[PDB]
């Protein structure tokens, strides 16, 4: 008796007092004080004011600068579009529902916001995986007579859409489901109930293996071999100071990306290990959704790491903002 069950929800609050209401009908001010709902709204507002300009500016400066429109950058545009799905499909609706105290859009809007907010975050995750594979193929050259062109970059972007749909669509057709999560103002995959009618247990395993373990292994391998190949080639040219300088900056950048991926990855692993063991207590209307609360920020720091620190995008964004010029 941890929470309260309904046909389309699970409110993480005991019902011995008879105060629980459907998160589609009445505010959930027993999960959290009204100011805690407002702080959720403020956090959504922060993500919107930082997420939309950075990600929209990425799409905009690509239009005004021809040198950005290379095939190896196509997957970066896919990342910026994915974050805009998170910004508009997830953060915006949550900011609206949070100020009511409950998900005012009903169960139909729960599937919609759940899908798009999950789709955007899933496109972003696999865009990072695809970019790691692309950089690995271009640098380590595992195929003897291979050149990465426009057709290959399109496959990689289209591949992210298949992977993201592979995660976001099954809950719409009966494998897992979309329910209000945490404070019941946004919607997402049901990791909180063992809903046997939709086989939630198998979907969590599938999510954990395919959309959690596999992305980590691919990123670590590709960048691992990449830094290995770069350091190996740089060792053969120790007389070139720029080669050593290029090797040092490639190492620092791969580290930054791998660390940034783990900052979004480890919270789920920490919640996993606490759910893997300790399977005997109620997770409050918050605990299990703490990784989600911080994984949203990937809509802000991923374009900062992968785009704003790209040498090309930075100068072009300065040029666009710058008007025309820029300090040289
Ligand atoms: O939705 C995503 C997609 C994603 C993928 C990578 C990152 Cl870095 C962030 C989000 N998550 C991952 C897999 C998932 C669900 C949440 O399954 C779990 C089962 C047990 C414990 C934690 C779990 O996390
Ligand atoms: C983008 C900003 C949107 C803000 C929408 C706020 C809508 C508030 O709506 C109000 O909410 C109260 C508590 O939920 C109710 O008691 C009121 O009846 C209702 O009018
Ligand atoms: C940039 C901010 C634009 C805000 C436009 C939001 C329009 C909603 O407007 C709000 O809707 C609520 C519905 O319950 C009403 O209770 C409020 O009185 C009304 O102001
Ligand atoms: C100190 C930071 C603690 C963060 C705890 C977040 C617990 C609530 O979790 C949040 O619930 C919202 C309701 O729709 C939504 C957000 O996606 C979710 O992260
Ligand atoms: C750096 C890694 C980028 C991957 C970001 C994936 C973010 C997806 O995060 C997911 O968002 C959903 C919608 O709010 C929620 O239902 C899930 O609980 C949450 O895990
Ligand atoms: C995908 C995993 C990322 C691999 C990052 C490897 C970080 C290595 O970093 C390098 O290691 C050298 C010793 O091996 C040090 O001497 C160098 O200072 C350092 O640049
Ligand atoms: C050359 O690049 C000309 C740029 C002209 C604009 C420079 C000033 C930008 C100010 C951005 C900071 C806005 C802060 C708003 C916070 C809500
Ligand atoms: C979501 C839900 O069922 N909430 C119930 C509600 O039906 C009722 O007003 C009260 C008394 O039983 O307990 C709570
Ligand atoms: C005090 C309270 O909330 N009572 C409710 C009652 O109004 C409602 O008809 C019923 C639903 O079956 O649940 C209980």
Rounded to the nearest angstrom, the distance between the alpha carbon of 324 and the centre of ligand 7 is 14
Contact 193, 212 (CB under 8 A): no
Torsions phi, psi for 223 (to 5 deg): -70, -30
Helix (H) or strand (E) holding 278: none
Ligand 1: residues within 6 Å at CB?
A: 125, 189, 191, 204, 207-208, 211-212, 215, 264-265, 268, 271-272, 275, 295
Alpha-carbon radius of gyration of the chain: 22
Resolution (Å units): 3.0
Ligand-binding site membership of 201 (annotated): yes
Neighbours of 301 (CB within 10 A): 16
- Ligand 8 close to Cβ of residue 22 (< 6 A): yes
- Ligand 8 close to Cβ of residue 20 (< 6 A): yes
- Experimental method used, please? X-ray
Rounded to the nearest angstrom, the distance between the alpha carbon of 100 and the centre of ligand 2 is 5
> Residues 227-234: contacts with CB within 8 Å, 24+ apart?
227/251, 227/254, 229/139, 229/140, 230/139
Ligand 5: residues within 6 Å at CB?
A: 90, 117-118, 121, 124-125, 128, 181, 186, 188-189, 261, 264, 292, 295, 298, 302
Instruction: Name the 3-class secondary structure at 144.
Output: coil
Pocket of ligand 2, candidates 25, 88, 99, 183: which has the most ligand atoms within 8 Å of its Cβ, to mutate? 99
Locus of tokens 């997770």: 283
Domains, the chain, in order of start with CATH, read 1-328 (1.20.1070.10)
> Residues 11-18: contacts with CB within 8 Å, 24+ apart?
11/180, 11/184, 11/285, 12/182, 12/192, 12/282, 12/283, 12/284, 12/285, 13/285
Looking at all shown ligands, the one closest to residue 101's CA atom is 2
Contact 185, 40 (CB under 8 A): yes
Neighbours of 325 (CB within 10 A): 7
């Amino acid at each position: 008796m941890c929470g309260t069950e309904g046909p389309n929800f699970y409110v993480p609050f005991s019902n011995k007092t008879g105060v629980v209401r459907s998160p589609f009908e009445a505010p959930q001010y027993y999960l959290a004080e009204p100011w805690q709902f407002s702080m959720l709204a403020a956090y959504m507002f922060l993500l919107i004011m930082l997420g939309f300009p950075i990600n929209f500016l990425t799409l905009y400066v690509t239009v005004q600068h021809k040198k950005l429109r290379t095939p190896l950058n196509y997957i970066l545009l896919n990342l910026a579009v994915a974050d805009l799905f998170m910004v508009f499909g997830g953060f915006t609706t949550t900011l609206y529902t949070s100020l009511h105290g409950y998900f005012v859009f009903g169960p139909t809007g729960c599937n919609l916001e759940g899908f798009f907010a999950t789709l955007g975050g899933e496109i972003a995750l696999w865009s990072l995986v695809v970019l790691a594979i692309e950089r690995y193929v271009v640098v380590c050259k595992p195929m003897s007579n291979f050149r990465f062109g426009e057709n290959h970059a399109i496959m990689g972007v289209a591949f992210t859409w298949v992977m993201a749909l592979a995660c976001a669509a099954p809950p719409l057709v009966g494998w897992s489901r979309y329910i209000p999560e945490g404070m019941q103002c946004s919607c997402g995959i049901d990791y909180y109930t063992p809903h046997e009618e939709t086989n939630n247990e198998s979907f969590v395993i599938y999510m954990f293996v395919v959309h959690f373990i596999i992305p980590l292994i691919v990123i670590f391998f590709c960048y691992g071999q990449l830094v290995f190949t770069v350091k190996e080639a740089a060792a053969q040219q120790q007389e070139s100071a720029t080669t050593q300088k290029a090797e040092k900056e490639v190492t620092r950048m791969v580290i930054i990306m791998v660390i940034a991926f783990l900052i979004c990855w480890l919270p789920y692993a920490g919640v996993a290990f606490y759910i893997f063991t300790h399977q005997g207590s109620c997770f409050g209307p918050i605990f299990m959704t703490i990784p989600a609360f911080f994984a949203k920020t990937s809509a802000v720091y991923n374009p900062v790491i992968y785009i704003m620190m790209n040498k090309q995008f930075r100068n072009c964004m300065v040029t666009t903002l710058c008007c025309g010029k820029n300090p040289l």
